[PDB]
């Protein structure tokens with residue numbers, strides 16, 4: 001779109017857009033195959049692999065961890081090094097708060113970034129490139145591919161776990177519920193969607209003004225939209241503006257509504 005190019009101009013940023021209406025197969029694309037650091041959006045796919053692995057009862061497994069597992073941002077995990085946390089609780093904290101220690105513990109449990117990669121390849125994702133813990137500070141730079149993905153691949157993988165057959169329905173329900181009750185995305189995709197429509201989302205933030213959000217958006221009646229809005233900027237220490245994500249989403253909704 002001229003419309004997306006305008007937003008890149010207004011915000012001095014690079015935009016990556018992919019949206020699929022699952023009820024019509026209509027598509028919205030703008031740099032859909034351009035790579036961006038996936039950042040915390042990977043937490044969503046990590047839980048997908050986690051669920052696939054485990055049974056639902058197995059998620060009640062208690063993980064004991066230490067202060068040495070605490071990283072830069074540990075809003076839930078810092079409160080329970082005494083008690084530990086169950087895998088289910090770690091998935092909650094990772095998805096809904098973007099608790100970084102929680103993600104690290106879950107990654108360890110699934111066998112690390114190498115194992116996460118191997119599992120994403122198995123579900124048909126050849127693009128997404130998990131390599132490191134804390135993705136995210138790698139880093140990296142242009143135009144290296146470690147810990148990156150594209151708007152297309154993230155949509156395709158999110159859809160696979162959340163909506164298709166990479167998971168049985170009761171595990172689907174957990175992932176979707178956690179993402180619906182995300183606390184970190186109010187100013188992003190959620191702010192670009194019409195009022196009262198349910199949204200499941202996972203946010204990401206990285207250097208180079210990288211600000212990301214992947215989402216499933218249910219219209220009142222009928223089939224959901226799966227969307228990835230990715231963004232980055234020129235300078236390593238550039239700041240992002242959440243408003244870019246909300247406005248991009250508005251453009252996407254107009255192109256499909």
Ligand SMILES: CC(=O)c1ccc2cc(N(C)C)ccc2c1
Nearest residue numbers: 071072100134136137205206207
């Ligand atoms: C887990 C971890 O060690 C870590 C450390 C620093 C981080 C800085 C970020 N931004 C400056 C956006 C984002 C994620 C980060 C994660």
